[PDB]
Design a protein around this ligand. Sequence first.
Ligand SMILES: [Zn+2]
Lengths: 221, 71, 129, 56, 25, 83, 101, 217, 132
Amino acid sequence: KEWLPVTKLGRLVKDMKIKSLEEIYLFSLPIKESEIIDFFLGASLKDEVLKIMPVQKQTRAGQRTRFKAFVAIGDYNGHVGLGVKCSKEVATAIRGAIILAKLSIVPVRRGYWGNKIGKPHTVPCKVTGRCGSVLVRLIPAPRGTGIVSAPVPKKLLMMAGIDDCYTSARGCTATLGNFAKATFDAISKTYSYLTPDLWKETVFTKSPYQEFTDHLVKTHT
Amino acid sequence: GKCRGLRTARKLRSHRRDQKWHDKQYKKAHLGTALKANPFGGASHAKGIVLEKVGVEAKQPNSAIRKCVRV
Amino acid sequence: VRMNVLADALKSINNAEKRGKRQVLIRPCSKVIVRFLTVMMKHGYIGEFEIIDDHRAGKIVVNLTGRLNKCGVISPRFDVQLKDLEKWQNNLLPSRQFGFIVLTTSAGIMDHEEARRKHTGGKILGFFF
Amino acid sequence: KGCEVVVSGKLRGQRAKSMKFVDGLMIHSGDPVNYYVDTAVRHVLLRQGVLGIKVK
Amino acid sequence: MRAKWRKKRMRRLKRKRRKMRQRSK
Amino acid sequence: MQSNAGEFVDLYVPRKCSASNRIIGAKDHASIQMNVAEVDKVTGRFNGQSKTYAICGAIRRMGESDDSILRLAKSSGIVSQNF
Amino acid sequence: TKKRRNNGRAKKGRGHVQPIRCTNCACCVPKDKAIKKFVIRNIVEAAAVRDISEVSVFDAYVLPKLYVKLHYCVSCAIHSKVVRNRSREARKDRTPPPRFR
Amino acid sequence: SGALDVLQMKEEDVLKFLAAGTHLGGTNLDFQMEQYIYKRKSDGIYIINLKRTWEKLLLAARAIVAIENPADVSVISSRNTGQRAVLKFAAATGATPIAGRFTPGTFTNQIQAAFREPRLLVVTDPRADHQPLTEASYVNLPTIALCNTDSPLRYVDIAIPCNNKGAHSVGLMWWMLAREVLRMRGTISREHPWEVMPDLYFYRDPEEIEKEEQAAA
Amino acid sequence: GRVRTKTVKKAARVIIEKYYTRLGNDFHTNKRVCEEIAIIPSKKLRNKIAGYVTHLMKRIQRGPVRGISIKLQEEERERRDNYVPEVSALDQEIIEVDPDTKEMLKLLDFGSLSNLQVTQPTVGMNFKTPRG
RNA sequence: CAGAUACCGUCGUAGUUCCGACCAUAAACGAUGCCGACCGGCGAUGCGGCGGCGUUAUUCCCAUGACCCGCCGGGCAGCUUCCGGGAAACCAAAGUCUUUGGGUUCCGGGGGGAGUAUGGUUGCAAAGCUGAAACUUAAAGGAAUUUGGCGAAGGGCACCACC
RNA sequence: AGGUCUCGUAGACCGUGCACCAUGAGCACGAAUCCU
Ligand SMILES: [Zn+2]
């Protein structure tokens, strides 16, 4: 129940200067501190475990076993994350998966199918991610349909917050880590796709360092 | 698809026919030799009367004898 | 040898757009290539494109901008109807809010929404988004 | 400055497996283990069997 | 038994079967 | 971006590159934010106005970033025309 | 798998080269595959040169040299320890071994 | 940054550049370096146009003075030619020095005692400093580098074309960049030369130190 | 063999870095210093530490050392790189200027300079090592 | 050597060489079909052509050959790269592939039975092409990682090893 | 007229292939989370 911010970003977040996490995503700062997201996203950041599988490295005297835990965390109105940690026991492997998933979290965008009435509910276009041999598609769906997929990307898109999707996977789907990372990579690059809805040139607002350099030279060495 | 031409459908149909013929399930289900060698003759059930009761053992990992019958 | 000049031109401009350059040397010339690039210009995807006059074959130099995702060719030329085009934009366009399908029409080389509102159809050419 | 707990015996099964819980600093050789680490070995009489505890 | 000597043994068996077939016509 | 009512539905609009006009996500950490000071014509001193540009990570990883910044200064008139 | 960029030899557009024979063995090996070694030797070795020059009638008599070319099959080359196996990362070193004396 | 009459060279900076041998480059060529070269002469040395070096140097000075905190500028040197030069540059312009043994994971490992958060990075040779460019890629860190005609322009943003082999040119342009940064900040004069001595940034081996020990008292 | 441990070497290096004017080359004297100014739990460790201190003195009295920084041995480096000569080595009466870069300089901004001269080009163009 | 019609050593018939008539088989392998467009850099090599300070065929000129400096076209290759691809080894093609369509020929649907039996065709013959089925099986495989064992190599140690 | 001209001698590539050497019965391999 304490915090010493070792980085400049942590001090800026703690000193009530940076408003949301959206501008941190906008300038693409590397978030090397876990509890920045804890400070921004509160109790709505619900987590659950995907699979705890064992990996074994054999030695001369028997074989040594380690457990790696795939854990996805995310908020149901946008941001979703995913983290893999391999350690000795299971509980601190779960905690390492929590901290590494809270480190690696990205925002998503939501669009419309056909008609633009109300809140966005589905993915804006056909987006596709790939890791390993696993190829995952995310195709927009009409309103009130629901996610149709395997249960693991289904729960990943529900914790992402999208209500409607169409999916089509290919490859060794049974490897849950590769499938989860492929779905996370597919949903992460929605801000890497250029659309005519935002063809206008973005005004270059300054970095928070450019306005809070006085505060940081007061509070740091 | 490999041969993509606007006036090419007989070649695609014949090649698909040959590669469909060169299969396992389709070759079994569309040749008469399998049903000639089928004891049931392509039927779900069959009747019969008992010759004798014999006994055969299991494979290498499982150690038991399974008591089949000769009909 | 060469079969479609539009396929080579679209592949060349797609490769030069992915590498991030700004000028593309389209070596063939055709009426369908000029009309296709004119449609892409009218829908706000490219800028000033050239036609270099020569007594052999013209060359086209385009002014690229960071606006094109992928432009491609559907070979061979598939004829469509008005009801048949919906499946083509279902399985070819990435979304319904953007993207275009250019198809040959007796009214000229012209996209799919305009061919829909003019109650017509014809052979397909390609797509861009 | 450091401690560790070892529990050995039949832990939820038939084969005897040992769990070792190390953290901190801990020496093992020479004389200073006489008057820096304190060793206590106890036996626990469970319903299933016996259990051994080493804390240092 | 590697593949080449298996092929040679199969060739010898084929020769013997061909000879007994042509002598048993 | 916009609905039938006219409200803005995206959380934020992402940054667009100055040179290649591409899009910058939250995972490409190689993207920079160059601030270039504007110097007054007569005194040769800093005034307080700057001209900022964004360079994407791919064109900076490839090595073509410096001529992109040079062309940006050519278009903005910071660097000389004859050069 | 593919161990080397080439196939352990030095043909790129030929398909066939004339065969040669090993020295320790009698193995038929292709010419561009065999590990050649053109050794430069002389008549006497290190210390007999003083005795030869003492017994040689001609003053300042220059000593002759023996030039032979040695061709090795790769098994006979490795068994004679003229070439040794290398690591996967350091296999791609076409520089010759350094000479000092 | 030199399109006007106030940010050009008049008569003597060209004398310093010709005396230090900055115009004499190398014998090979990088594929992005034909912009800043004139043509090959005899004995295979590529000569560098002086206004291109001037404009890139003044653009680097503008980039340095544009940020507020001078301690956020990080100077890096690894070779022996530019050790004291970046120390004097950090003493003059307020930068922060790493000269010799840039440890890996300096900008990424956030628990080290030597972990630093800069905002602008400058080096002396991206061939000799191929290690801090990797961490400069891993964080949001633009780089300004002092490149020769043979140096690869990978992971760089502002490239100053020069000669970085001899220590004379390296010391001269570190002093030169120091004076233009101090001019654009607004401390020293523009028509009166600040040139109290330009040999303070030059590197010298201790053999000539013991030579002048033998020569003088 | 007699190879010193990281503890002995580290303690000797830090005791040279902290204290320098209270030691010497005599082993028993700085053995007594190392006994007085530090806490050492043994006699043999104290003797090993004092021996490595004496070896460090014999190293230091020759020349510079790359591991130990001493304030009395410091200020000498900035003494050597603070003073400057009278000649700046940049303002001479002759500058070696090739005719090609002279023609380059004539195109640049100038028609004539007061400190430049023109030499002759070489008769033969060889500039690379023979490698084929 | 226990056995040795095997490794080894000495002889030695067909064959190895040339001509005339056959068969059409190889790890015939770059284990990578042909044509065509695009997509980075660098040092070199072989050919043909173009341009240029200089040295030589003994001293002047020109052209030819021989060096040096560069360019163009075709080709055998090489180094490097976070273009990109792949399961990876790796590949400037094995890239431009879910953002899936340049033209076109052949060819594979888990492993074994099996390149087997019959039929046809070809061949003096040996064999070549075409080519199944019943039955049996839950794995057979490709790349890479860590102690493992080598009558594998390179360095050290031990009187529970030797001298 | 003078008398062994001068700075150190790693002043080793001299060494190719080295007898006989087979076999191994098997039952046991276990796959993990939270603070009150
Ligand atoms: Zn041999």
